[PDB]
Structure 1
Amino acid sequence: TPWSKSELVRQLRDLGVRSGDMVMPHVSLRAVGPLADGPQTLVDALIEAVGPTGNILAFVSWRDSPYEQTLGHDAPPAAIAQSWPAFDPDHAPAYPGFGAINEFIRTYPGCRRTAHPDASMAAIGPDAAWLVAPHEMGAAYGPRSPIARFLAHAGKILSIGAGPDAVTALHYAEAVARIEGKRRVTYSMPLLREGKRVWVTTSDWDSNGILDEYAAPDGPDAVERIARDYLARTRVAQGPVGGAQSRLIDAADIVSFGIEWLEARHAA
């Protein structure tokens, strides 16, 4: 029979989620299996698990981000520029390919949303406003991003049946890693500034592979290779959440591991 909220809360407590914790979930709902009231039951359990003084941060992005449509141009192509919707943080659906749970997180009453349309983060809790801003274009996952502040706030990464490729915080490791040959990308996003639609073009680190050898689509990335090597070497709390094998990862520790991992393999 489908998992109940209190059952999930018990599993999260066993895993090491505490009242006051700041948690970043990565969830495969197919692994979890049927839920009493659908995905909201797990959203509710995470909110109950972290308590009223805890916080949830999620990488939700945007269903309609014009990423591929502007990549590699110094300006949005005319047909894109002339009609694309402005990013409206309180009305933009999450990108479905990063987990169906993100649309439930981001529509939760009181949730905050970062202003980076492609890297958009969602946060719930007393620290949500501090988490989500600033989030400038050009600072998607590195210093000054919500990922950076999460790492400075004892964040835990909660992987719920998700693979080692689904660790967005490791992009911070890619951003600051002192290695040669790091790829950069240029794209354009449409923000709303004082009700006016404004196209902004910026450059950031390539989040589809920080080095040439990691950016092949067929095709494991650096995140997957770092996270798997880390889990092979580190004691990490493991156990079920629903039907999904889950991990509770110290975010500061795995990112610090990732910096050492990349810099040891590539010259400074």
Structure 2
Amino acid sequence: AMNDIVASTQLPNTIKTITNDLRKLGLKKGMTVIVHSSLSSIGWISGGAVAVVEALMEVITEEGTIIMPTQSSDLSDPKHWSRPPVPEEWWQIIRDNVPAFEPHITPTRAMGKVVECFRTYPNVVRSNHPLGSFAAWGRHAEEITVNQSLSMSLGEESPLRKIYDLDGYILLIGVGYDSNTSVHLSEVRSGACELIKVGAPIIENGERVWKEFVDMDYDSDKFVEIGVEFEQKGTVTMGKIGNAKCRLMKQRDIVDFGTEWFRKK
């Protein structure tokens, strides 16, 4: 309900107030940052998702880099679907008919309106993976998004590793660690999960192909627990953007912690 969102807000959030809140929390010009958001968590915003994207770009600038996950699990093999599952009798029709990934076109699923706004901005570029893409904007946009591997999509050949190499930051706006994509790189590095056979529809040599490949069975339901232990160290900056509880942290910090956590089990 928009009703509850308006009832819960004292004054409008605007590009200007958001920009203020972001700077207060520690975002600054030139920073490399991957962002995860819930728009409704902030309270009512004048301009909605556009105001958030504009505020982020204002603070970070073209001399910095904004990254967001642009996952499209709508295109994944339906045998592994539980959110919701679909009947087994549909599975093969989906493989034969789900449209192939095209980075300018394919909508995201479960990423949020901010992401949908962001990925269609001018000068925003998207990585090539049919399930596990990211979108970036700014100084290191091209470098972060190019040459993502089909297999091991969130691993050492992915945008996550490039953010790591850039000593980047993670901003969570009113969401928890189950939305912290970067912790998948901890899974890869720790060998935390099983490999499984997955599939996705791609344009390959100029035609739709249902492509089979192997990826880790990524599982964000362990992340919340990792997050609680991580924040005992006291290296996460916490604060508000409007009504939302937000967290700013160094990506290497949580990735390294997650890797050591999985290894010790």
Partner of 2:100: 86
Partner of 2:210: 199
Partner of 1:48: 58
- What whole-Å deviation, never above 9, does each CA across 1:191-243 have from its counterpart, x for those lacking one? 1234321221111111136xxxxxxxxxxx22211112101222321111121
Once the two structures are overlaid, the 10-residue window that deviates more, 229-238 or 60-69, is 60-69
Distance change >3 Å, CA 236–CA 81, structure 1 → 2: closer
Distance 2:242 2:177 in 1: 19
Q: Secondary structure at the match of 1:36?
A: coil
Partner of 1:131: 144
Using the aligned pairs only, state the percent identity. 30
Q: Secondary structure at the match of 1:12?
A: helix
Partner of 2:224: 224
Residue 157 of structure 1 pairs with residue 193 of structure 2: no
- Give the counterpart of 1:107 among 113, 120, 123: 120
Residue 255 of structure 1 pairs with residue 255 of structure 2: yes
Corresponding letter in the other structure for 2:211: V
Q: Displacement, 1:34?
A: 1.1
Corresponding letter in the other structure for 1:151: Y
Check whether the contact 2:239–2:246 (CA below 8 A) recurs between aligned residues: yes
Once the two structures are overlaid, the 10-residue window that deviates more, 133-142 or 245-254, is 133-142
Once the two structures are overlaid, the 10-residue window that deviates more, 188-197 or 128-137, is 188-197
Once the two structures are overlaid, the 10-residue window that deviates more, 109-118 or 226-235, is 226-235
Q: Secondary structure at the match of 1:101?
A: helix
Distance 1:193 1:202 in 2: 14
- What whole-Å deviation, never above 9, does each CA across 1:27-53 have from its counterpart, x for those lacking one? 111211111111110111111110120
Distance 1:235 1:87 in 2: 38
Q: Secondary structure at the match of 2:223?
A: helix
Residue 166 of structure 1 pairs with residue 179 of structure 2: yes
Distance change >3 Å, CA 233–CA 70, structure 1 → 2: closer
Q: Displacement, 1:171?
A: 0.5
- What whole-Å deviation, never above 9, does each CA across 1:94-118 have from its counterpart, x for those lacking one? 11x2322110111111111111111
Q: Displacement, 1:69?
A: 4.7
Q: Displacement, 1:178?
A: 5.0
Distance 1:164 1:123 in 2: 21
Q: Displacement, 1:126?
A: 2.5
Partner of 1:27: 37
Partner of 1:185: 196
Name the TM-score, length of structure 1 as normaliser: 0.87
Corresponding letter in the other structure for 2:189: V
Q: Secondary structure at the match of 2:240?
A: strand
Corresponding letter in the other structure for 2:233: R
Name the TM-score, length of structure 2 as normaliser: 0.87
Corresponding letter in the other structure for 1:31: S
Check whether the contact 1:136–1:145 (CA below 8 A) recurs between aligned residues: yes
Once the two structures are overlaid, the 10-residue window that deviates more, 200-209 or 139-148, is 200-209
Q: Displacement, 1:249?
A: 0.8
- Give the counterpart of 2:20 among 4, 7, 10: 10
Check whether the contact 1:55–1:125 (CA below 8 A) recurs between aligned residues: yes
Distance 1:131 1:14 in 2: 27
Aligned positions, number: 247
Distance 1:146 1:32 in 2: 27
- Give the counterpart of 1:61 among 67, 71, 74: 71
Q: Displacement, 1:67?
A: 3.4
Segments of structure 1 that go 5 or more residues without pairing to the other structure are 210-220
Once the two structures are overlaid, the 10-residue window that deviates more, 97-106 or 39-48, is 97-106
